[PDB]
Design a protein around this ligand. Structure first.
Ligand SMILES: Cc1cc2nc3c(=O)[nH]c(=O)nc-3n(C[C@H](O)[C@H](O)[C@H](O)COP(=O)(O)O)c2cc1C
Ligand code: SF4
Ligand code: SF4
Ligand code: SF4
Ligand code: FES
Ligand code: FES
Ligand SMILES: [Ca+2]
Lengths: 156, 905, 146
């Protein structure tokens, strides 16, 4: 039983104003719903589809194509650690081991309290300051395995 | 254009790509993602050839032949070692994740992926890692889904979305986890979803109705037939095994239905396999039934009919031209009556008069796609003539095709054409009583009663030409929309006007004729299309005869005592109580039919007619084209007690036993010659197919493939002694493997497509002059009438505005693709697809009567009250009530009728 | 936009230009120009076949040009200082400057604006400070993961 809120719908039409075809606001509509709700649930696909005037298959294909549009529930904080080549050279595997030890989860899983979701991600464009990771909207660089338990406690 | 393939020079079309040009030349290039009807996208990379810059080039470069134009002076190599290696590598990459499924996969023996795996010569597996897997979806009763077998060739989504206009199929996910299907479990909503089973080169989408009684393609017995489920005339290949109709494949006709059927034709065949079908002649004595063989039935029926004073006939638009003519010969022309109602007959003859005396060319179904403006008047085309709706969708995409051609973009590069023509389209204006499936692409949809639709048509005709009669009392908003339609139609280089008899109004057809005449008088290249109801409606209209009401009055006054009824459920065209009274009064009722109808309990004699699978004949489509269908199998082969003959064979034998007291059955060509000798307007049905003496170098045409198996064991449970091969004296086809099905054979009737190395539906490439064109020696079927030199006059009988009346509910027809054609409703798989019968109400009318959605209301028609649950329909205007035509209890003759005492139950 | 450099009638010249920011949803293939155009239209970011090029029929079928951030940042210096200034930055076949850098286990990983023709050893040793202590240089990638 999904229903778009007034703020979500108004933001979607304001995104629709910027293009000559309302299909072009599909990614931003999915991101608006994800920012409000943490992820994109099943009824949000049909809601966004009927707002934009495009089929729900198109919205679901867009949502499942892009990795940052979550179609499964996530925790309250999403840790996204870079597993690309420069951070591999700089030692992201120690960071991944420290995160796995602290959270007692595998990548792609959510902690038992629903606090953290661990995700590998492609290169964050911060390779000179690696290894890097992203928590919900913040980038943390120059990561060490010792600073991971201290820095993870800043997000409740 | 001149191309050079492997050192050989060829002349090709320069507007074609290299893949279609080389496949038209007989060369074999493997391919997956290209289809002749869908264009080229270059996804699968299977069609790689080596292109050289010039003749003195040795390095070359690998290109996709589907994405490369066949320009003048092209130099390519197919059998180059690097190109062969890359094509084998593409097959190998597709094979890494492919499941070990061929024995338990319905595509085996008919699989394009199997054929291309063998064609590339890849048979050794060196991949040793894990295979990706997928969960499957439930896609409804017709299509079974198996995503493990997907090769991600994107054919399904391209056909379903870009071609067919469907919205509930798509591609999801990413890199090697691409998933093709619906966003959730549910039935595929497209009326043309059944073409996925031939579009998909693997066993992802399979015919579930076939899967219930599965057999392999080499085990089938095929025949070239015509789909019986509506008036379009799509060519089909019914395939049978062990006495039962197993599958309906599309049979390529470059003029009619080229690659595609609708789901009614593809899946509505299951009535043939019904167990309650009549198998032998049955005569009732008192309250008991006795079974006769054919000779005793002929002798007894001839004796009783000879004792009678006047025998009358009731034909059917279900039945072929030969059987209706044989009925008309048995009872006499003056005593022959068409089985359809008086108003239905008047609309059908008006449509025929417009078609063959209106002076405006009627296009074939393939030709519909070239018109640049479409006006549909009254006809719910998607639910009644669905393939016309598909063709109209292509004609609408013609505008994007034109804008892409202006920018020098090749006509096969479909992605560029879709990108250039973003949402621009040719003008489509549909009118109906409610919303149609064409509304997503229609420039305008007019929801109005049938007289208001006719008034719109007459106003359009008067605004196109002042000589056309005017319509008084047009609202300014409706006048502005009429001006929009008129400006779209006047500036069109090729306007098309579609109407039909399903709308149930004569004035809609007259308005369509007046619009066509007004466009003709301005020098435009206007075409007109009429949509009839049933498979041989136009043939019965050309033959003519009195209406069913005249036959009912003959049987009710008593001056006719014997009635023959051919292939007709009389409750569809008349009220059931009057039919039951006239048949209970009649001292002799004889019914020749292949389905257990409701008038067989009052039938004194019942003859087991053959269905289209077990009969030969000629049917006339709504284009006016005579098309011959052929018998698929002999019903007496497995069950020797089955006496199931052709209807014209029954009626000719009856006429012979009446006259000379001798039983002569007939041959088919004798009946054809009789039709063309007595009826000069049906003289074209002689040339629809060659006669039974036709040979390909002395040998007949085979009905079954070369590797047809089990010939000494399929009847061995009955008797170990093999029976004789069935003999076909009727046609040029043989009921065996001992025949010809070569793609180069000089014929137009092809029972099935097969070529060595091409076991899939892609063998139709080998059966064509060019791929996506016509059959090599012409498509079968001929036009009965040409365009008249002079047109009609303007019809001046403009109907008045619809006024609602209190206590009088005008019935608006709501046709359904699954449910409005009688035999297809009899198919058991259509019961799952069967919509619940809901009576449609306006919100205002339902609020006035105090009924919400889902409540049961009872209405009285013909002195009988029936109850149906309410569905709220916003577009249906007040004073109308919406009823599903052709369903169980709601006859199509009720369309356009009034209704009394609609009360809440 | 407040200063009149964006919007309607820019600098009193009758030129109308509106600039939007479209934030992505995390796929590497969207950086490819035709796949970028498909992603901007709200579709799955599959690339397109060329020809036709985006200059003829690109975003929504209209003429479209896709350019990198650094190219567009190089444009105003060209049009403010002249063509002959940009041609005389370096005596190489590739005119102008370029953001070059070194990453990895180097002493000073970073980014510096250098003319074309600077050798990789000059970036590695003079600017990046060489490798770290106790690390021997094995290999290098010049321009990214690809
Ligand atoms: C897989 C792939 C990813 C790409 N990613 C980017 C990118 O992230 N940023 C970028 O500017 N160009 C990227 N490109 C290059 C573009 O196709 C294109 O050349 C560029 O965006 C604009 O061209 P320009 O360098 O002349 O400005 C990518 C190309 C490919 C094949
Ligand atoms: S789709 Fe073709 S290759 Fe795959 S399992 Fe079925 S028959 Fe075999
Ligand atoms: S489901 Fe069939 S048609 Fe669709 S991409 Fe896969 S193999 Fe091709
Ligand atoms: S459009 Fe009519 S003739 Fe063609 S497949 Fe459908 S029901 Fe049969
Ligand atoms: S490689 Fe990790 S931020 Fe670029
Ligand atoms: S058929 Fe040419 S790449 Fe698929
Ligand atoms: Ca026969």
């Amino acid at each position: 039983a999904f229903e778009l809120s007034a703020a979500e719908r108004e933001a979607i039409e304001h995104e629709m104003h910027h293009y000559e075809d309302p299909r072009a606001a599909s990614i931003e509509a999915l991101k608006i719903v994800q920012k409000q709700r943490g992820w994109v649930p099943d009824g949000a696909i049909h809601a966004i589809a009927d707002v934009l005037g495009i089929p729900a298959s198109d919205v679901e294909g867009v949502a499942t194509f892009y990795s940052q549009i979550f179609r499964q529930p996530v925790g309250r904080h999403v840790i996204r650690y870079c597993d690309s080549v420069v951070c591999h050279i700089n030692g992201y595997q120690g960071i991944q081991a420290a995160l796995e030890k602290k959270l007692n989860i595998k990548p792609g899983q959510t902690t038992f309290d629903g606090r953290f979701t661990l995700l590998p991600t492609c290169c964050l464009g911060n390779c000179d300051k690696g290894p890097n990771m992203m928590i919900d909207e913040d980038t943390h660089a120059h990561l060490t395995p010792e600073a991971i338990p201290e820095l993870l406690e800043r997000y409740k | 254009a001149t191309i050079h393939v492997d050192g050989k020079e060829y002349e090709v079309n320069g507007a074609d790509n290299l893949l279609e040009a080389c496949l038209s030349l007989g060369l074999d290039i493997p391919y997956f993602c290209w289809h002749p009807a869908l264009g080229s996208v270059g996804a699968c990379r299977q069609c790689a050839v080596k292109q050289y810059q010039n003749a003195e080039d040795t390095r070359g470069r690998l290109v996709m032949s589907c994405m490369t134009p066949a320009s003048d002076g092209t130099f390519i190599s197919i059998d180059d070692e690097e190109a062969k290696q890359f094509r084998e590598s593409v097959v190998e990459w597709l094979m890494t994740n492919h499941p070990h499924d061929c024995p338990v996969c319905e595509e085996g023996g008919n699989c394009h992926l199997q054929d291309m795996t063998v064609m590339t010569g890849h048979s050794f597996r060196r991949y040793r890692f894990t295979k990706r897997t997928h969960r499957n979806q439930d896609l409804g009763p017709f299509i079974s889904h198996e995503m493990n077998r997907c090769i991600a060739c994107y054919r399904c989504v391209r056909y379903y979305k870009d071609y067919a206009g469907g919205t509930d199929l798509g591609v999801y996910g990413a890199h090697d986890n691409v998933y093709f299907g619906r966003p959730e479990d549910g039935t595929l909503e497209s009326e043309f979803s059944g073409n996925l089973v031939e579009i998909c080169p693997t066993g992802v989408f399979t015919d579930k109705t076939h899967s219930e009684r599965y057999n392999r393609k080499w085990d089938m017995q095929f025949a070239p037939s015509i789909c019986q489920q509506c008036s379009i005339g799509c060519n089909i290949s019914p395939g049978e095994r062990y006495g039962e109709l197993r599958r309906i494949e599309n049979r390529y006709n470059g003029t009619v239905n080229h690659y595609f059927l609708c789901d009614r034709g593809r899946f509505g065949y299951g009535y043939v396999n019904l167990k309650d079908r009549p198998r032998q002649p049955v005569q009732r004595r008192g309250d008991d039934f006795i079974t006769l063989n054919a000779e005793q039935a002929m002798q007894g029926a001839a004796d009783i009919l000879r004792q009678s004073k006047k025998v009358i006939g009731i034909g059917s638009p279900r039945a072929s031209v030969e059987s209706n003519f044989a009925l008309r010969e048995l009872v006499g022309e003056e005593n022959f009556y068409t089985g359809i109602a008086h108003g239905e007959q008047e609309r059908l003859q008006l449509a025929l008069k417009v078609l063959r005396e209106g002076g405006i060319y009627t296009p074939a179904l393939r030709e519909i796609e070239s018109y640049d403006a479409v006006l549909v008047l009254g006809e719910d085309v998607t639910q009644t003539g669905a393939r016309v709706a598909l063709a109209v969708r292509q004609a609408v995409k013609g505008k994007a095709r034109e804008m892409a051609a202006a920018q020098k973009v090749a006509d096969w590069q479909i992605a560029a054409i879709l990108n250039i023509g973003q949402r621009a389209k040719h003008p489509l204006f549909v009118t109906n009583v409610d919303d149609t499936r064409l509304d997503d692409i229609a420039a305008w949809t007019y929801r109005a009663p049938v007289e208001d639709q006719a008034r719109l048509g007459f106003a359009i005709a008067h605004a196109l030409d002042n000589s056309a009669p005017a319509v008084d009392g047009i609202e300014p908003e409706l006048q502005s929309k009429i001006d929009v339609i008129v400006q779209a139609l006047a500036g069109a280089k090729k306007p098309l006007i579609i109407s039909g008899t399903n709308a149930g109004s004569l004035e809609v057809i007259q308005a369509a004729a007046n619009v066509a005449k007004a466009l003709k008088g301005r020098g435009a290249d206007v075409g007109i299309t009429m949509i009839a109801r049933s498979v041989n409606s136009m043939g019965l209209g050309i033959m003519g005869g009195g209406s069913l009401e005249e036959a009912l009055t003959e049987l009710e006054t008593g001056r006719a005592d014997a009635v023959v009824v051919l292939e007709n459920d009389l409750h569809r065209h008349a009220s059931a109580t009057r039919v039951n009274a006239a048949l209970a009064k009649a001292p002799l009722v004889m019914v020749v039919d292949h389905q257990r109808t409701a008038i067989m309990e009052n039938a004194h004699l019942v003859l087991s007619a053959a269905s289209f699978a077990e009969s030969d004949g000629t049917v006339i489509n709504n284009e006016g084209r005579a098309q011959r269908f052929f018998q698929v199998y002999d019903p007496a082969y497995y069950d020797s007690k089955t006496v199931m003959l052709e209807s014209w064979r029954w009626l000719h034998s009856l006429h012979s036993t009446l006259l000379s007291r001798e039983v002569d059955w007939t041959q088919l060509d004798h009946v054809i010659d009789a039709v063309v000798a007595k009826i000069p307007e049906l003289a074209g049905i002689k040339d629809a197919a060659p006669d039974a003496t036709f040979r390909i170098r002395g040998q007949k045409l085979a009905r079954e493939p070369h590797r047809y198996s089990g010939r000494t064991a399929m009847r061995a449970n009955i008797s170990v002694h093999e029976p004789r091969q069935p003999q076909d004296i009727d046609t040029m086809f043989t009921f065996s493997m001992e025949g010809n099905n070569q793609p180069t054979a000089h014929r137009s009737q092809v029972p099935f497509a097969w070529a060595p190395g091409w076991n899939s539906p892609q063998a139709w490439n080998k059966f064509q002059d060019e791929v996506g064109g016509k059959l090599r020696f012409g498509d079968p079927g001929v036009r009965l009438f040409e365009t008249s030199e002079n047109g009609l006059d303007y019809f001046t009988s403009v109907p008045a505005r619809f006024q609602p009346q209190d206590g009088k509910w005008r019935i608006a027809p709501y046709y359904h693709l699954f449910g409005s054609d009688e035999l297809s409703q009899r198919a058991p798989v259509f019961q799952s697809r069967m919509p619940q019968p809901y009576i449609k109400l306006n919100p205002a009318d339902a609020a006035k009567l105090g009924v919400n959605a889902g409540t049961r209301v009872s209405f009285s028609y013909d002195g009988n009250t029936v109850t149906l649950p309410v569905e709220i329909a916003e577009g249906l205007t007040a004073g109308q009530v919406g009823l599903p035509m052709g369903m169980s209890g709601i006859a199509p003759v009720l369309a356009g009728a009034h209704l009394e005492d609609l009360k809440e139950a | 936009t407040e200063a009149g450099l964006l919007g309607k009638n820019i600098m009193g010249t009758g030129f109308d230009f509106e600039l939007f920011v479209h934030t992505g949803a995390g796929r590497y293939i969207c950086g490819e120009e035709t796949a970028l155009i498909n992603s901007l239209e709200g579709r799955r970011a599959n690339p397109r076949s060329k020809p036709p090029f985006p200059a003829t029929s690109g975003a929504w079928g209209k003429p479209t040009c896709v350019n990198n951030v650094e190219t567009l940042c190089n444009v105003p210096a060209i049009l403010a200082n002249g063509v002959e200034w940009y041609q005389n930055i370096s005596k190489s076949k590739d005119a102008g400057t370029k953001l070059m850098g070194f990453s990895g286990r180097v002493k000073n990983p970073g980014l510096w604006e250098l003319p074309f023709g600077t050798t990789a050893r000059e970036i590695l040793e003079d600017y990046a400070g060489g490798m770290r202590d106790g690390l021997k240089f094995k290999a290098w990638q010049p321009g990214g993961a690809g």
